[PDB]
């Protein structure tokens, strides 16, 4: 009821369970990919694996 | 009825590549 005190008001809930695994990704953040370089020392990030 | 399982029924415990190793 709209007259309820805040502890007795309704709250909507979402729980985001991240399937963080050593496995192929299908959800990723909004990050731009570069070209790939080989046989040279580079800094890198593969699917967040820095 | 019953039979012996021998050493059947083992699987890859995780999705990580490994080679030339003994893993507990
Ligand atoms: C267990 O399996 C063997 C064959 O592998 C069978 O001869 C035996 O009867 C089984 N054990 C019991 C308690 O029945």
PDB file of C-alpha atoms and ligand atoms in Angstrom:
ATOM      1  CA  UNK A   1       0.000   0.000   0.000  1.00  0.00           C
ATOM      2  CA  UNK A   2       1.319   3.567  -0.745  1.00  0.00           C
ATOM      3  CA  UNK A   3       0.747   4.467   2.980  1.00  0.00           C
ATOM      4  CA  UNK A   4       3.321   1.782   4.082  1.00  0.00           C
ATOM      5  CA  UNK A   5       6.531   2.889   5.865  1.00  0.00           C
ATOM      6  CA  UNK A   6       9.647   2.470   3.648  1.00  0.00           C
ATOM      7  CA  UNK A   7      10.630  -0.985   5.068  1.00  0.00           C
ATOM      8  CA  UNK A   8       7.133  -2.306   4.099  1.00  0.00           C
ATOM      9  CA  UNK A   9       7.133  -0.685   0.604  1.00  0.00           C
ATOM     10  CA  UNK A  10       7.844  -2.893  -2.477  1.00  0.00           C
ATOM     11  CA  UNK A  11      11.344  -3.052  -3.977  1.00  0.00           C
ATOM     12  CA  UNK A  12      12.189  -4.532  -7.380  1.00  0.00           C
ATOM     13  CA  UNK A  13      15.411  -6.579  -7.405  1.00  0.00           C
ATOM     14  CA  UNK A  14      17.764  -7.748 -10.153  1.00  0.00           C
ATOM     15  CA  UNK A  15      20.703 -10.050  -9.371  1.00  0.00           C
ATOM     16  CA  UNK A  16      23.296 -10.237 -12.172  1.00  0.00           C
ATOM     17  CA  UNK A  17      25.048 -13.624 -11.809  1.00  0.00           C
ATOM     18  CA  UNK A  18      28.205 -13.271 -13.943  1.00  0.00           C
ATOM     19  CA  UNK A  19      29.240 -16.614 -15.527  1.00  0.00           C
ATOM     20  CA  UNK A  20      32.926 -15.779 -15.002  1.00  0.00           C
ATOM     21  CA  UNK A  21      34.768 -18.899 -16.272  1.00  0.00           C
ATOM     22  CA  UNK A  22      37.991 -20.150 -17.924  1.00  0.00           C
ATOM     23  CA  UNK A  23      35.665 -20.606 -20.951  1.00  0.00           C
ATOM     24  CA  UNK A  24      34.559 -18.883 -24.257  1.00  0.00           C
ATOM     25  CA  UNK A  25      32.943 -15.456 -23.712  1.00  0.00           C
ATOM     26  CA  UNK A  26      29.595 -14.285 -25.178  1.00  0.00           C
ATOM     27  CA  UNK A  27      28.854 -11.198 -23.008  1.00  0.00           C
ATOM     28  CA  UNK A  28      31.582  -8.515 -23.052  1.00  0.00           C
ATOM     29  CA  UNK A  29      31.936  -4.843 -22.039  1.00  0.00           C
ATOM     30  CA  UNK A  30      31.926  -1.976 -24.625  1.00  0.00           C
ATOM     31  CA  UNK A  31      35.696  -2.261 -25.484  1.00  0.00           C
ATOM     32  CA  UNK A  32      37.316  -1.627 -28.933  1.00  0.00           C
ATOM     33  CA  UNK A  33      39.554  -4.432 -30.337  1.00  0.00           C
ATOM     34  CA  UNK A  34      42.937  -3.686 -32.016  1.00  0.00           C
ATOM     35  CA  UNK A  35      44.878  -5.579 -34.681  1.00  0.00           C
ATOM     36  CA  UNK A  36      47.141  -8.505 -33.500  1.00  0.00           C
ATOM     37  CA  UNK A  37      51.008  -8.400 -33.346  1.00  0.00           C
ATOM     38  CA  UNK A  38      53.380 -11.450 -33.200  1.00  0.00           C
ATOM     39  CA  UNK A  39      57.087 -12.250 -32.512  1.00  0.00           C
ATOM     40  CA  UNK A  40      57.435  -8.906 -30.583  1.00  0.00           C
ATOM     41  CA  UNK A  41      57.046  -7.944 -26.885  1.00  0.00           C
ATOM     42  CA  UNK A  42      53.571  -6.351 -26.376  1.00  0.00           C
ATOM     43  CA  UNK A  43      51.111  -5.536 -23.613  1.00  0.00           C
ATOM     44  CA  UNK A  44      47.832  -7.491 -24.191  1.00  0.00           C
ATOM     45  CA  UNK A  45      44.195  -8.095 -23.198  1.00  0.00           C
ATOM     46  CA  UNK A  46      42.178 -11.158 -24.397  1.00  0.00           C
ATOM     47  CA  UNK A  47      38.512 -11.043 -23.158  1.00  0.00           C
ATOM     48  CA  UNK A  48      39.717  -9.131 -20.004  1.00  0.00           C
ATOM     49  CA  UNK A  49      42.715 -11.522 -19.502  1.00  0.00           C
ATOM     50  CA  UNK A  50      45.452  -8.830 -19.262  1.00  0.00           C
TER      51      UNK A  50
ATOM     52  CA  UNK B   1      22.608 -57.494 -12.129  1.00  0.00           C
ATOM     53  CA  UNK B   2      26.102 -55.901 -11.696  1.00  0.00           C
ATOM     54  CA  UNK B   3      29.454 -55.473 -13.493  1.00  0.00           C
ATOM     55  CA  UNK B   4      32.855 -53.917 -12.660  1.00  0.00           C
ATOM     56  CA  UNK B   5      33.333 -50.220 -13.673  1.00  0.00           C
ATOM     57  CA  UNK B   6      37.150 -50.625 -14.112  1.00  0.00           C
ATOM     58  CA  UNK B   7      38.602 -47.069 -14.613  1.00  0.00           C
ATOM     59  CA  UNK B   8      35.606 -45.704 -16.667  1.00  0.00           C
ATOM     60  CA  UNK B   9      33.751 -42.422 -15.952  1.00  0.00           C
ATOM     61  CA  UNK B  10      36.485 -39.720 -15.686  1.00  0.00           C
ATOM     62  CA  UNK B  11      36.007 -36.305 -17.313  1.00  0.00           C
ATOM     63  CA  UNK B  12      37.867 -32.975 -17.838  1.00  0.00           C
ATOM     64  CA  UNK B  13      37.265 -31.146 -14.475  1.00  0.00           C
ATOM     65  CA  UNK B  14      37.605 -27.604 -16.005  1.00  0.00           C
ATOM     66  CA  UNK B  15      37.895 -25.770 -19.388  1.00  0.00           C
ATOM     67  CA  UNK B  16      41.686 -25.036 -19.088  1.00  0.00           C
ATOM     68  CA  UNK B  17      44.246 -26.519 -21.506  1.00  0.00           C
ATOM     69  CA  UNK B  18      47.149 -28.382 -19.799  1.00  0.00           C
ATOM     70  CA  UNK B  19      49.869 -30.706 -21.170  1.00  0.00           C
ATOM     71  CA  UNK B  20      52.740 -32.907 -19.849  1.00  0.00           C
ATOM     72  CA  UNK B  21      51.507 -32.555 -16.212  1.00  0.00           C
ATOM     73  CA  UNK B  22      50.072 -34.568 -13.296  1.00  0.00           C
ATOM     74  CA  UNK B  23      47.150 -32.582 -11.813  1.00  0.00           C
ATOM     75  CA  UNK B  24      45.421 -33.213  -8.439  1.00  0.00           C
TER      76      UNK B  24
HETATM   77  C1  LIG C   1      29.562 -56.731  -7.695  1.00  0.00           C
HETATM   78  O1  LIG C   1      29.819 -56.962  -9.117  1.00  0.00           O
HETATM   79  C2  LIG C   1      30.339 -58.315  -9.407  1.00  0.00           C
HETATM   80  C3  LIG C   1      30.754 -58.344 -10.877  1.00  0.00           C
HETATM   81  O2  LIG C   1      31.566 -57.180 -11.108  1.00  0.00           O
HETATM   82  C4  LIG C   1      29.248 -59.324  -9.033  1.00  0.00           C
HETATM   83  O3  LIG C   1      29.747 -60.662  -9.239  1.00  0.00           O
HETATM   84  C5  LIG C   1      28.851 -59.182  -7.553  1.00  0.00           C
HETATM   85  O4  LIG C   1      27.725 -60.069  -7.312  1.00  0.00           O
HETATM   86  C6  LIG C   1      28.488 -57.726  -7.181  1.00  0.00           C
HETATM   87  N1  LIG C   1      28.342 -57.582  -5.733  1.00  0.00           N
HETATM   88  C7  LIG C   1      27.257 -57.933  -5.050  1.00  0.00           C
HETATM   89  C8  LIG C   1      27.278 -57.666  -3.535  1.00  0.00           C
HETATM   90  O5  LIG C   1      26.307 -58.477  -5.611  1.00  0.00           O
END
